[PDB]
Design a protein around this ligand. Structure first.
Ligand SMILES: [Zn+2]
Length: 46
């Protein structure tokens, strides 16, 4: 039958990288950048 099941309509997006939250995606990704490395790898694994 129909399909209706969710958790909430607020900060539904949760960063699987650290565990943060965000109302939308843009607001989330913009933060996920901290987990995104660049060509020039730093002292950390990445
Ligand atoms: Zn995060």
């Amino acid at each position: 039958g129909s399909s209706g099941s969710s958790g909430t309509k607020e900060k539904p997006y949760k960063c699987y990288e650290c565990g943060k939250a965000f109302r939308t995606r843009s607001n989330l990704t913009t933060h996920q950048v901290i987990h995104t490395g660049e060509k020039r790898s730093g002292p950390s694994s990445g």
